[PDB]
């Protein structure tokens, strides 16, 4: 049956990450039907190579290779987003960012900018709900550039342009009332750069300069000069960069600054306007 095969795997991934879902989605793509199916019928078998291949994808994920990598796609909170080791694997915690962005977009749609887009994750989850407005993605690493461009085309969305330039580098059309961004915010020396899934993502996609504050601070200052007037700059940052990021805005910006929590652990987004 199916299940049988699954547990053959479960015993494997036992310590690496937390097992079952891995296999499920990992085999949910193979003859890969639905997950509700597999649950309903993990009765039904699979072709041999069909199976072996998985038997092999296992070791890959065993050492530690990201599942998403192996699958090559990721359900961002809502959508199918094709991925490629050159950008970040769209984390959920980027809930705050997209939820507050929206909790503030009804107030103001048109002309928005997703900084360091990466894959199109936010820009994309943003533009779909909001075609009334336009979305702009940018990145300084060619792969992510196209990687966004790709996903952008799959779900086939409208009026969003991705680009290759340093943050504001190629930008002059700042009449954005809303800029959003999940930049690199990790300490060059952080030991978490050493744990699990992160040993596999780009230093670029992850590393910030000062203390992990360099790019944050820099888009704040640089990005706010845009003159967005009442417009917002929303940013994602590690749990422990709240106060710093908080302060950051102030020394740099104008309106009430707010640090809103993500899911459980903490503050994961900080915003304020001009
Ligand atoms: N100096 C720079 N100028 C523009 N984009 C940059 C940049 N440095 C990094 N970036 C892009 O911004 C990304 C932040 S990682 C997260 C990407 C995306 N915002 C998402 O939430 O997944 C980096 O991976 C890189 O693709």
UniProtKB/Swiss-Prot annotation:
Q: Without the gene, what phenotype results?
A: Cells lacking this gene suffer severe growth defects, but also show a global shift in gene expression to anaerobic respiration. Also shows defects in translational termination via an enhanced rate of read-through of nonsense codons and induction of transfer-mRNA-mediated tagging of proteins within the cell.
State a single Gene Ontology molecular function.
protein methyltransferase activity
The main enzyme category here is transferase
SUPFAM superfamilies membership: S-adenosyl-L-methionine-dependent methyltransferases (SSF53335)
- Tell me the residue numbers annotated for binding S-adenosyl-L-methionine: 116-120, 139, 167, 182
Listed under GO biological process in this entry are: peptidyl-glutamine methylation; protein methylation; regulation of gene expression; translational termination
Q: What is its EC number?
A: 2.1.1.297
Instruction: Explain the purpose of this protein.
Output: Methylates the class 1 translation termination release factors RF1/PrfA and RF2/PrfB on the glutamine residue of the universally conserved GGQ motif, i.e. on 'Gln-235' in RF1 and on 'Gln-252' in RF2.
Quote the NCBIfam families the UniProt record gives.
hemK_fam, RF_mod_PrmC
What's this protein's name?
Release factor glutamine methyltransferase
Q: State the organism named in the record.
A: Escherichia coli (strain K12)
């Amino acid at each position: 049956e199916y299940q049988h095969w699954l547990r053959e795997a479960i015993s494997q991934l036992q310590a690496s990450e937390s097992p079952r879902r891995d296999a499920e989605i990992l085999l949910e793509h193979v003859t890969g039907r639905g997950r509700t199916f597999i649950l309903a019928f993990g009765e039904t078998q699979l072709t041999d190579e069909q199976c072996q291949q998985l038997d092999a994808l296992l070791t890959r994920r065993r050492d530690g290779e990201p599942i998403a990598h192996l699958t090559g796609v990721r359900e961002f909170w809502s959508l199918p987003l094709f991925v490629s080791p050159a950008t970040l694997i769209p984390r959920p915690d980027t809930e705050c960012l997209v939820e507050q962005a929206l909790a503030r977009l009804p107030e103001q749609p048109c002309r928005i900018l997703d900084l360091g887009t990466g894959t199109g994750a936010i820009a994309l989850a943003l533009a779909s709900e909001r075609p009334d407005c336009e979305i702009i993605a940018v990145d300084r690493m060619p792969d992510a550039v196209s990687l966004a461009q790709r996903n952008a085309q799959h779900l086939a969305i409208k009026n969003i342009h991705i680009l290759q330039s340093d943050w504001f580098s190629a930008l002059a059309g700042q009449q954005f009332a809303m800029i959003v961004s999940n930049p690199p915010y990790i300490d060059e020396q952080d030991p978490h750069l050493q744990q699990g899934d992160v040993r596999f993502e780009p230093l670029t996609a992850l590393v910030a300069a000062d203390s992990g504050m360099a790019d944050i601070v820099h888009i704040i200052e640089q990005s706010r000069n845009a003159l967005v007037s009442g417009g917002f700059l929303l940013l994602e940052h590690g749990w422990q960069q709240g106060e710093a990021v908080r302060q950051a805005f102030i020394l740099a910006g104008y309106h009430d600054v707010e640090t809103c929590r993500d899911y459980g652990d903490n503050e994961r987004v900080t915003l304020g306007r001009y």
